[PDB]
Amino acid sequence: YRPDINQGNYLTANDVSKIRVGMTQQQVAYALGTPLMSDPFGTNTWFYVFRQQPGHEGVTQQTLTLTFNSSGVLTNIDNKPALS
Template identity: 35%
Template sequence: MPRIPACLGLAALLVCGSGCSYFSDFSMPLPTFYKTKVRQGNYLDEATLGTITPGMSKREVQQRLGTPLVTDPFHQNRWDYVYSYRPGTYDDGEPEQRRVTLYFERDVLSRVEYPPQG
């Protein structure tokens, strides 16, 4: 008698496991869940970045760009602004990531770097 529940359990496991291959045999899409678009970090457009010039104080930079996303406690003269975008389920956009690094000397902006985006 204990064999019947074991056989039923094995049969149920086989049916459930083969259910995924049922959809792939036909041209039916698998059901998807809604994903919302996600924007993280500081959005920096070209116009805003064009207003940043070497010689500006940290306070002036922060007023224009906002608080940096990353401040390294070991390199306090470096600010990293990072922005990433992941489109949602029904959006036609591509994933995007931008990064801008600012270097300061004696609390004055010395240079701005735009690492290659990729």
């Protein structure tokens, strides 16, 4: 009855494999893009969320949390492909 509800960044499953531990922010911005959300409470940590909810068919949410360091250098990746 309702329209499609889309939120976040479109991850193509071929970009998330282009990112290794050691890349700065410009590189991940060229590969994946600029995210819509982050952690404003001090730390630098980006969240690429990919959420889609069509009409009365379910939700799909992929989460990619990238934890950087103080000098713009990737330090940890965390991928949740499906939501419980």
